[PDB]
Write a protein that binds this DNA or RNA. Sequence first.
RNA 1: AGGGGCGUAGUUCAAUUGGUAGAGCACCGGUCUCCAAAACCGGGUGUUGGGAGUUCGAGUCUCUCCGCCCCUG
RNA 2: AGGGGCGUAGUUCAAGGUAGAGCACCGGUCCAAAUGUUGGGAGUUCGAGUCUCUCCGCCCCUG
Lengths: 334, 311
Amino acid sequence: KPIVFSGAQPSGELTIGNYMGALRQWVNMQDDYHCIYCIVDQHAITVRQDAQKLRKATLDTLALYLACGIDPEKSTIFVQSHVPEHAQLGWALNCYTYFGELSRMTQFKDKAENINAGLFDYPVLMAADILLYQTNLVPVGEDQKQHLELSRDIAQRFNALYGEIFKVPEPFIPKSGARVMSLLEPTKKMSKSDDNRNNVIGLLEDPKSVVKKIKRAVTDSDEPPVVRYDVQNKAGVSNLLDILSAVTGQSIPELEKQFEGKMYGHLKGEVADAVSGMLTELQERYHRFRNDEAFLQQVMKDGAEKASAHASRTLKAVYEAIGFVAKRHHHHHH
Amino acid sequence: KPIVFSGAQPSGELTIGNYMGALRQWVNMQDDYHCIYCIVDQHAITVRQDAQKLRKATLDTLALYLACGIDPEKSTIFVQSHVPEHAQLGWALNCYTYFGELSRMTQFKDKSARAENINAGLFDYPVLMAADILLYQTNLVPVGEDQKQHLELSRDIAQRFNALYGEIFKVPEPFIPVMSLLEPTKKMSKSDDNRNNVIGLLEDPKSVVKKIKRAVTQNKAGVSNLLDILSAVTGQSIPELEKQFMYGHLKGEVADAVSGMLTELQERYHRFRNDEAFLQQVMKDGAEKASAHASRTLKAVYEAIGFVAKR
RNA sequence: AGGGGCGUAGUUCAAUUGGUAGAGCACCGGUCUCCAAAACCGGGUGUUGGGAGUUCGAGUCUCUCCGCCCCUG
RNA sequence: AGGGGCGUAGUUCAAGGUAGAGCACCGGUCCAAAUGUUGGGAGUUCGAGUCUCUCCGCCCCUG
């Protein structure tokens, strides 16, 4: 079974695009694949932020993944900081990553108040994240192909010097989920990092907010009004259909037939009642999980236990190749 | 009691300058100070090298410190990598050290002048040295071998993290404390390719006699230093030596003097070095003792930073 | 550890010679759409880093603190 | 993932016609001082450090 590493950034309200395009289909693939979901809190402190907020953000992100359907029996779900092997391999990989590679990373080269070594050094740690678990499928994140390429460069550069300690990871492009485009720029896809949030709709949004946001979405000035799928000409109405089709499963031609003679104010309202209906169940659930302090502390405890087992195997193999003397655990440790 | 952290580079072979300069004294200081000795194998990989050699080295270096007199039950001696807290705090302190400060470092800027392995390692290491120090609530750091900037930075980071989160760290302070043979104008350093210009703690009289015979002989400083050595080897002074003392006699006398200083050192090493079970026990006990302290500091950082804690 | 510097609406920038902190962009309304956009029509930004001085008058001069930037070893 | 550039002895180097340096260190005072693998392979050529191709390592660049 192929092993898949995804990272859950503690900040960044999951959008309906994230859900329907990616995580929804990945919920249905936990038995075929060995999916690992790591809450990368050590990657978040690269940017300064409120200590209580990050702690709550970590716990928020956990419950929502659970709320999105990640089964902690089938899949491994943990907090990056709770598995030391991450920092630990991170340092060793610093010695097999070159200054220029890190500095030519398009993001950093761009950044202006916290040019910390975290910001610069994150891509090595992100390669330590992938490589510990012998990952072979990586779902290439947003604006982060560079990063996986650097992981592949690191792992080959290490394995070339010492042997196949690591699996070279390949990018994961699963079943393309729904096509969710930004609500005021249907040319652009929906991004969790969108500074203007009217292009987005988070998974935990008031039915009112869902309505207010789909109401402001861009349409066209076609007279007569038409609900037809033309991605070139009718983008915003195309997008409204792709979203709706995704929530309901109905086809684009079915939707067109259903909206014959209806205007856009109706399609909007209809798309908003369908979105918010989906998010009521997933929001019901979320709070159950978010309130169940015990259950949360258990999914963490069990989850990190499963990770830190698989990671120390790899970390031992690395430190062996490296030239280090092994930690002396107990007389009868092997 | 004042907590002293000192890092032990595996690869470098210790010189008589190191021992009479520091260790010999420090050995007789483990009851007044809380001394900590960290064999920094993770700082060693920033350069490429033979894996098997390092391993040996680490141990050779460990066993040599135990022979020079370091009590594993009075001090904390251990191998850096055997404590994860170091990389854990290294990562976190990476996010509080500025790109400028690091690039500004003399040691990097220069390798960025030309240019062999400009790796994240050569760049981020001064942060890891800061993790090394702040983990153990260090009070005093023996700064030597062009590592004053690295303490300054360690002080400057501790001041910064503290100023934002609480006084979780202690600001380290520089502890206030022989020249190279064929270049008395230069000091005797383990990091000198010419080991004819140095004299190892484990060198045998034949090799010790041989190396000193070629010593260049304040205006005759090769003489002056060759005498200074005896001054610390014998216990005598300069006037007693200026009176007691051709130059072959001085050379032959520092030979029998220094190799006579190395005796219990060498004899202890060969028993320690081969008793791998003893080493295994010393690395296990030091590491267990180090984690217990380092994990305490680390817990406090992880709470200040805002991380959810484990259990 | 020494040594230099910078700090203005959300953002990018002004404010001559010490005399009334303003623009673009973004954003917000209003008009406008079935809804949106666009289009017009307006609107509002600001801890001038914090504090202390100097002056009749300080974004402009001085000090101090803060944070960051640059330099050296 | 793509696109350029570089590679000579320990080190810095010199030079389509058969590879020279320097510095470094090793040889020759009581004591001390005071060389060739042109990255590898394959081509083109009478002839290849030089030209083409390919690989390897690193450097620069883009997202």
